[PDB]
C-alpha cells in the first residue's frame, strides 16, 4: 500500500471518492433542518435518509 | 440560438432537468445535465481481444 | 414457469450484540432485491409505531437557552438523555411520569416510581447528575403514543421534545451477486438493522412485512 | 441520422463510391433490393442509346476489414429523380448522409 | 390505523396510455408503493413476441428474395415489434399469404379466433412485382423478461423475442383536494401500453407478485 520510492500511500481516491466526501461534508448558512441538537450518528443518517 | 431553441420546444432554459433514482425512487439534490448525444463504436470488440 | 419465481432461505441471522440483526436472503430475481430493500427500509425509517418522550413539563428556569445551578450536566444534555430514554406502554395511550431525587450522585432510570402499564426497558441508562446536595431536581415527563419521527419545529412553558416513536435507530440494505443453476443475473439481500432493547429486530421486520401485506391486501384474491 | 451534424456529410455520400446515383434524370419503374430500374426521361434520350438504365446492387460482400457492406434502396415505385439524386444507401449512409 | 388503498377510478383517454390512480394512501406509503409497482411492472412481465418465422423462400437471414422491397433482416426486425394477443395458447402458428403489388400490413394473416392483432396498420415488407408472393410460418411464444436467441433444419430463422408489454410507467404523488384527513394523499399511476394487455389486470398481477415475494419475510 506504500510507494517504494518514498513513505506515503499509494492507495488514493483519485476523482469520484474524493468529490463525494467534498459534497458530503460541506458547510452551508442555512438548509433544511439547521439549528437542532441530535443524540448521535444513527440519528443523523436517519434524518438523512 | 440554442436557448431560443430550447424555448422553443417548451424546454428549460439552462437544459438540466431534475432527475429521479432508479432504484430508491428519490429526487437527486442537484439537477443533471439530461439530453441527446451522437455516440460511435471503435472496432475494438473484445471478442477479438480475449 | 412464467408465473413462478425464486424463494429465498431464512437462516442466515448473524446477531453481533443483544439486539443488532444481520440476515442475508438469497437467491432472488434479478432487480428484486433494492424493490424489496428500499421498500422495507422507508417502512421502518419513519411509519412505525410507538411511544416517545414528547414534552416536558419543568418548574425550574421558564426560558430555555439558560442554565442551572447545583447541577453538572446542561438542560441540553438531560433533552438528549431524555431522547434516548426507551419506554412502551401496554394498554394506555399517554401517560405522566414524575422524577423526583435530591442527592449526591447520578439519577438512573429506576429512581422513577414504577406503574402499571410503564416499563422502563433498561434501568441503567443515565439522565444527569446532582454534584451538590441542597440541588433537588423535580421533573415531569410526557410519554405519548405516535408514529415515526417528527421534530420540535413543526410543533409549535414546557420544552418541546424531537419524539422518537419508531423503535429501530439504523437501517441499512445492502444488495450482492449470487448464483443457482448458471444464472448469474440475481441478486442477495443483506439487510443489517441495529435495534434498542425495546422490541427484537426480526419481530420489527415481521411488523413492517405484515403492514406492507395489509397494505395491499386491497387487490391480491 | 445524426441530429446535430454539419453539412459537409453529403459530400462525403455522393463522393465516394460507396452508394448508388442517378446518372440521367427519369422515373424509377421497377424497385428491389437486387436492382434498380430506372426509366430515363425524353430530354436525356440518347438516339442510339439501350434506352434505361439498370444499377445493380451489393447485397453483403466482404470488406478488407471483415465488415458486412451493402447497399439497401430508398426510393418508392414511381418517384421522379433526377442527376446527381442517390438511389441507395450504402453502409453508414440515411438518405444520402453519413450515418455514423 | 391503516387504510386501504382502492382502484376506483380508471381513465382510458387512448389506445396506448392509460391512467390509474390509487386511493386512498397515507403519507409515506405513496412514493414506496409506487415505486414497488413501478419496478415490479418494470423488471418481469408477462408477454407473448414473435420467438421464430420459418420462410420457404429463403434460405438464411443474410439473403434476399426477388419481388421485396425491404430486406428479410428487415422482415424479422418488423415482426420482431409485432404486438399479438393470445387467449388461452402459448404455441400459435400464424400463416401469411399475399399476391399483388401492394404493402403487407397486419390483417394479411389467417384469424385463428384466440389470437387478437391489436393493431392492423403495422406494416411488415412491401411487394414491387405482381407474380412475387411469400409465405411464413410465425411462431408466437408466451414468456416473460428479455433473452436472445444465442442462449436458446436450415430454413428456420431464429429471432430475439421481447415479452415485456410496458414501455414506461410514470407515477406522481398528489394532494387530496377534498378529505375529512388532510394527511391522506393519492398516487397516479400512467403506463403506457402497446395494447396486448390490461392495465387493471398487470396492477392486479403486480400486486400479488409482491405479495408472493413478500410472503417470505413473515416466516422470519
Same mark, same amino acid.
Given at each position: 500500500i506504500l510507494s517504494p520510492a518514498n513513505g506515503e500511500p499509494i492507495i488514493v481516491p483519485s476523482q469520484d471518492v474524493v468529490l463525494g466526501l467534498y459534497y458530503m461534508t460541506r458547510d452551508c448558512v442555512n438548509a433544511k433542518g439547521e439549528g437542532m441538537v441530535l443524540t448521535g450518528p444513527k440519528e443523523a443518517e436517519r434524518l438523512y435518509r | 440560438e440554442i436557448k431560443e431553441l430550447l424555448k422553443l420546444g417548451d424546454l428549460p432554459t439552462?437544459? =438540466?432537468?431534475?432527475?429521479?433514482?432508479?432504484?430508491?425512487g428519490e429526487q437527486f439534490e442537484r439537477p443533471v445535465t439530461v439530453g441527446y448525444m451522437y455516440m460511435l463504436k471503435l472496432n475494438h470488440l473484445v471478442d477479438d481481444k480475449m | 414457469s412464467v408465473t413462478e419465481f425464486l424463494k429465498p432461505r431464512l437462516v442466515d441471522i448473524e =446477531?453481533?450484540?443483544?439486539?443488532?440483526?444481520?440476515? %442475508?436472503?438469497?437467491?432472488?430475481?434479478?432487480?428484486?432485491?433494492? %424493490?424489496?430493500?428500499?421498500?422495507?427500509?422507508?417502512?421502518?425509517? /419513519?411509519?412505525?409505531?410507538?411511544?416517545?418522550?414528547?414534552?416536558v413539563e419543568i418548574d425550574g428556569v421558564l426560558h430555555e437557552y439558560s442554565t442551572k445551578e447545583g447541577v453538572q450536566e446542561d438542560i441540553l444534555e438531560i433533552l438528549l438523555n431524555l431522547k434516548g430514554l426507551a419506554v412502551r406502554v401496554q394498554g394506555k395511550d399517554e401517560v405522566i411520569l414524575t422524577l423526583n431525587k435530591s442527592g449526591i450522585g447520578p439519577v438512573t432510570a429506576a429512581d422513577i416510581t414504577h406503574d402499571g402499564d410503564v416499563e422502563i426497558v433498561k434501568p441503567q441508562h443515565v439522565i444527569c447528575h446532582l454534584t451538590d446536595?441542597?440541588?433537588?431536581?423535580?421533573?415531569?415527563?410526557?410519554?405519548?403514543?405516535?408514529?415515526?419521527?417528527?421534530?420540535?419545529?413543526?410543533?409549535?412553558?414546557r420544552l418541546l421534545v424531537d419524539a422518537c416513536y419508531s423503535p429501530v435507530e439504523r437501517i441499512a440494505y445492502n444488495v450482492e451477486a449470487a448464483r443457482v443453476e448458471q444464472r448469474t443475473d440475481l441478486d442477495k439481500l443483506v439487510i443489517e438493522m441495529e435495534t434498542n432493547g425495546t422490541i427484537d429486530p426480526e419481530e420489527a421486520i415481521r411488523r413492517a412485512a405484515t403492514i406492507l401485506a395489509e397494505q395491499l391486501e386491497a387487490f391480491v384474491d | 441520422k445524426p441530429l446535430v451534424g454539419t453539412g459537409m456529410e453529403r459530400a462525403v455520400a455522393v463522393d465516394? &463510391?460507396?452508394?448508388?446515383?442517378?446518372?440521367? &434524370?427519369?422515373?424509377?419503374?421497377?424497385? @428491389?433490393? /437486387?436492382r434498380i430500374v430506372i426509366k430515363v426521361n425524353? @430530354?436525356?434520350?440518347?438516339?442510339?442509346?439501350?434506352?434505361? @438504365?439498370?444499377?445493380?446492387?451489393?447485397?453483403?460482400?466482404?470488406?478488407? =476489414?471483415?465488415?458486412?457492406?451493402?447497399?439497401?434502396?430508398?426510393?418508392?415505385?414511381?418517384?421522379?429523380?433526377?442527376?446527381?439524386?442517390?438511389?441507395?444507401?450504402?453502409?453508414? %449512409? @440515411?438518405?444520402?448522409?453519413?450515418?455514423?
Open positions: - | 439552462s437544459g =438540466q432537468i431534475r432527475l429521479y433514482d432508479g432504484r430508491t | =446477531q453481533v450484540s443483544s439486539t443488532h440483526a444481520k440476515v %442475508t436472503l438469497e437467491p432472488l430475481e434479478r432487480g428484486f432485491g433494492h %424493490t424489496l430493500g428500499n421498500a422495507l427500509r422507508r417502512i421502518l425509517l /419513519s411509519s412505525m409505531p410507538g411511544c416517545a418522550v414528547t414534552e446536595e441542597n440541588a433537588s431536581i423535580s421533573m415531569r415527563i410526557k410519554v405519548q403514543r405516535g408514529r415515526g419521527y417528527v421534530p420540535a419545529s413543526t410543533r409549535i412553558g | 465516394s &463510391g460507396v452508394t448508388a446515383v442517378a446518372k440521367r &434524370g427519369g422515373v424509377v419503374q421497377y424497385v @428491389d433490393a /437486387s425524353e @430530354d436525356e434520350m440518347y438516339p442510339g442509346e439501350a434506352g434505361i @438504365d439498370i444499377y445493380n446492387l451489393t447485397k453483403y460482400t466482404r470488406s478488407n =476489414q471483415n465488415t458486412c457492406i451493402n447497399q439497401m434502396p430508398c426510393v418508392s415505385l414511381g418517384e421522379p429523380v433526377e442527376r446527381g439524386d442517390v438511389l441507395a444507401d450504402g453502409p453508414s %449512409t @440515411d438518405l444520402g448522409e453519413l450515418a455514423l
